C-alpha cells in the first residue's frame, strides 16, 4: 500500500483538464438535439450530466490520494463525495445501455419506434433509473464514512479487509447488477443493430463497416474502462465469502489503478457520443 501517489492523481488531473470542457460541449450538443424532437438527446443529456458530477467529485479524491490516503475534509465530505462518485459511476453505464437499446429499436423496428411522444417516455425511464441507482447506493451511505487505521490512512468508503459480508454481498450484487447486466444489454442491442441491417439494399459495404466498427467498439471501450474495477471488486468479495491481509496487500495497487481507469470513461463517452457523430459534431461547430 502507498504506491498510488502518481497514477490516480495523474488520471484525475487529465480528466479534470480535458473532460470538463468536453463534457460541457457534449452536454450542449445533447441539448441542441432535444429541441429537435429527438429522444436520444435526453439520454445523452443525462449521461453528460452524470459525467459532469463525477468530474466535480474528482478533485477531493485527487487530494485524498496524493495526501497518502487521509480524508482531511471531514466525515460529511466523505459521505457526499463518495456517494456522488460511486453513483455516477453506475449511472453512466445504465445510460449507455439505454442509448444502445434505443438505437437497436430505432434500427431493427423502424416503422414502429418511437412514434408516440418519444421525449416523455425517455425522461420517465431516466428518472426511474436515477431513482433505482440512488436507492441501491444509499445503504453504503447508511454506514460509517471513515475508518481510521494504524498506518496513516483513515479510509473513506473502503475497508481492508471488508466488514463481515454486509458490504460483501452488497458488492457482489452491485457488480452483477450495475455491470454485466447493462453491459450485456449493450452488447446484445448493438449486435442486434448490426444484424438487422444485414439484408438492407440501401447500405453499401462501406457504410456497413462504419456501423460494425461503432457497434463492436463502444461495448469494447465501455468494457475496457469499467472492467478492471468490477473484476477486482468481484474477486475481493468472492474471496471474502469463501487469509489475513495477504490478498489485499497484493492487489491493492491494482484496485486503485482500476478505479482510475474506470473514471477515465468521462473522456471516452463525450468523444464517442458527441464528436464521432457527424450531426452532433456539426452542431458543436455551431456551438463554438
Swiss-Prot record:
Family per record: Belongs to the G-protein coupled receptor 1 family.
Enumerate the transmembrane spans.
1-33, 38-68, 74-109, 118-144, 161-199, 204-239, 248-276
Annotated site residues (Required for activation) in this chain: 133
Q: What segment(s) does the record annotate as region Extracellular loop 2 (ECL2)? A: 145-160
Provide any one GO MF term from the record.
G protein-coupled receptor activity
Location (main, coarse): membrane
Q: What residue range is the signal peptide?
A: none
Topology of this chain in the membrane: Multi-pass membrane protein
Cell compartments where the protein resides = Cell membrane
Domain statement: A multitude of proton-sensing residues, which include extracellular histidine residues or triad of buried acidic residues, contribute to activation of the G-protein coupled receptor activity and pH sensitivity.
A Gene Ontology BP annotation from the UniProt entry: cellular response to acidic pH
User: Keywords for this entry?
Assistant: Cell membrane, Disulfide bond, G-protein coupled receptor, Glycoprotein, Membrane, Receptor, Transducer, Transmembrane, Transmembrane helix
The source organism is Xenopus tropicalis
Sequence ranges on the Cytoplasmic membrane side: 34-37, 110-117, 200-203
- Its protein name is G-protein coupled receptor 4
General function of this protein: Proton-sensing G-protein coupled receptor activated by extracellular pH, which is required to monitor pH changes and generate adaptive reactions. Activated by an optimal pH of 6.0-6.6, a more acidic pH compared to mammals. Ligand binding causes a conformation change that triggers signaling via guanine nucleotide-binding proteins (G proteins) and modulates the activity of downstream effectors, such as adenylate cyclase. Gpr4 is mainly coupled to G(s) G proteins and mediates activation of adenylate cyclase activity.
An example of a Gene Ontology cellular component annotation for this protein is: plasma membrane
Site, Proton sensing: residue positions: 147, 153, 256
Parts of the chain on the Extracellular side: 69-73, 145-160
